[PDB]
Design an enzyme around this catalytic site. Structure first.
Site, mmCIF file in Angstrom:
data_model
loop_
_atom_site.group_PDB
_atom_site.id
_atom_site.type_symbol
_atom_site.label_atom_id
_atom_site.label_comp_id
_atom_site.label_asym_id
_atom_site.label_seq_id
_atom_site.Cartn_x
_atom_site.Cartn_y
_atom_site.Cartn_z
ATOM 1 N N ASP A 198 0.983 -1.192 0.199
ATOM 2 C CA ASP A 198 0.052 -0.103 -0.061
ATOM 3 C C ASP A 198 0.961 1.417 -0.563
ATOM 4 O O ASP A 198 1.832 1.360 0.808
ATOM 5 C CB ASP A 198 -0.917 0.121 0.771
ATOM 6 N N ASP B 68 -0.502 5.246 0.685
ATOM 7 C CA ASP B 68 -0.791 5.970 1.971
ATOM 8 C C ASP B 68 -0.807 5.136 3.261
ATOM 9 O O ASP B 68 -1.420 4.176 3.248
ATOM 10 C CB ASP B 68 -2.259 6.305 1.556
ATOM 11 N N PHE C 98 0.529 9.967 4.498
ATOM 12 C CA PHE C 98 -0.561 10.338 4.429
ATOM 13 C C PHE C 98 -0.809 11.443 5.261
ATOM 14 O O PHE C 98 -1.768 12.758 5.642
ATOM 15 C CB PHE C 98 -1.583 9.954 4.125
ATOM 16 N N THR D 265 -2.567 1.061 -5.048
ATOM 17 C CA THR D 265 -3.221 1.533 -3.985
ATOM 18 C C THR D 265 -4.055 2.611 -4.858
ATOM 19 O O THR D 265 -4.748 2.524 -5.916
ATOM 20 C CB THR D 265 -1.895 2.728 -4.089
ATOM 21 N N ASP E 259 -2.271 -0.619 6.014
ATOM 22 C CA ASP E 259 -2.725 -0.098 7.077
ATOM 23 C C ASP E 259 -4.149 0.387 7.251
ATOM 24 O O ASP E 259 -4.932 -0.046 8.790
ATOM 25 C CB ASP E 259 -2.304 1.657 7.333
#
Ligand SMILES: O=c1[nH]c(=O)n([C@H]2C[C@H]3O[C@](c4ccccc4)(P(=O)(O)O)OC[C@H]3O2)cc1/C=C/P(=O)(O)O
Ligand SMILES: O=c1[nH]c(=O)n([C@H]2C[C@H]3O[C@](c4ccccc4)(P(=O)(O)O)OC[C@H]3O2)cc1/C=C/P(=O)(O)O
Ligand SMILES: [Mg+2]
Ligand SMILES: [Mg+2]
Lengths: 193, 193
Positions: A7, A9, A15, A96, A142
């Site tokens: 991933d 961000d 981010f 992403t 995340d």
């Protein structure tokens, strides 16, 4: 080859820190949420509970030109992914999701990858709002709950630590990657034949 | 749900016609390749054999701002995909590769989808240089040989007819979708339980 989806961000690109910096600079007289106090995946929902109209102001930060492009890499992220991609029998894709407002975000994500990983790494980018249809051995992300059209994704989802998920108790045998300083190689090796 | 990946350039969007129009308008005194005479997947390779320096001029067309955005839909494409996506137990993704020069192309592909299919359809876009890592029942794509990191893709590749592939004999049991006027529903139904 072992296939790993990473991933962007909150994993590669900061981010959360970027958002806070830009929000404080643009809205200096509004209250804000310190990174340590972030709760829930959706930044704007937390901001919206803090004061009326703050959700819309939060949204205007990530909709602004250069927001994605100027995100700083998380510590260790660029080094780790570069090393990971150079490993034998190991294919790494940056997987992403662009935001709905598409004027800048997809472009800047490509530009960011070029900037930190180089032109050759652009072939490794997958943009999608649905990660369950991308097949791989591992997904490092995340976000706690990753869903979509495929009810049984082929990847094992390894939860990348972020302030918003740091307290979460996971259902065994789900596991975490605590940061890029953590032993990602051992996680990958555990999926190899 | 049955899952169908649909390519963009040469399937949804008329890359070949768009390219020729813009090339002729920009380079009116150069020779060109009529659509009927297109041979080989790579436009610039054919142009390069026609005259020295023509490959670079061809490349400058698709690198230009608005090239992707101003492509016309192929006849029937928008109607067919909209109907396809509305079918029960049917998930449709637009699975397309951006060009290496990323300044305009990813952005314009999002903008094109919004323009012809509407905002809600933006969730169905997958941008990737590797389609073999996207899992599905079917891939409708004009490119004859689709390869990448996954040696055994889960999809059946249905070849969408284009002038560059129209003479190609395919290895049974490979099959074609001859245009969007052709019976795509029967192809989908053949993969259902
Ligand atoms: O972690 C995040 N937290 C967060 O608050 N946001 C913001 C930005 C915007 O992102 C979205 C979003 C939803 C899903 C996937 C990406 C972005 P939208 O495109 O729907 O506006 O969700 C609402 C907003 O929430 C994005 C992300 C990035 C999600 P990922 O890392 O791309 O999965
Ligand atoms: O059919 C095509 N024919 C064609 O000549 N091109 C051109 C544009 C540019 O596209 C590329 C290209 C290669 C692979 C995937 C997409 C584009 P590059 O990004 O490498 O420059 O290949 C060289 C050039 O060839 C693209 C396409 C679009 C391929 P797809 O429909 O995206 O698979
Ligand atoms: Mg994330
Ligand atoms: Mg194509």
């Amino acid at each position: 080859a072992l296939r790993v989806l990473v991933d962007m961000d909150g994993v590669l690109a900061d981010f959360e820190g970027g958002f806070l910096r830009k929000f404080r600079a643009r809205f200096p007289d509004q209250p804000f949420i310190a990174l340590e106090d972030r709760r829930g995946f959706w930044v704007s929902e937390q901001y919206g509970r803090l004061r009326p109209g703050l959700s819309e102001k939060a949204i205007s930060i990530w909709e602004s030109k250069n927001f994605f492009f100027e995100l700083e890499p998380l510590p260790g992220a660029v080094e780790a992914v570069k090393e990971m991609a150079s490993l034998q029998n190991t294919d790494v894709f940056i997987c992403t999701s662009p935001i709905k407002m598409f004027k800048y975000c997809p472009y800047e994500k490509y530009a960011w990858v070029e900037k930190y990983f180089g032109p050759d790494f652009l072939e490794q980018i997958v943009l999608t709002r649905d990660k369950t249809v991308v097949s791989a051995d591992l997904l490092i992300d995340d976000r706690p709950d990753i869903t979509g059209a495929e009810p049984t994704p082929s990847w094992e989802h390894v939860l990348f630590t972020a302030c918003h998920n740091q307290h979460l108790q996971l259902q065994p045998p789900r596991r975490r990657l605590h940061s890029w300083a953590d032993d990602w190689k051992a996680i990958l090796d555990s999926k190899r034949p």
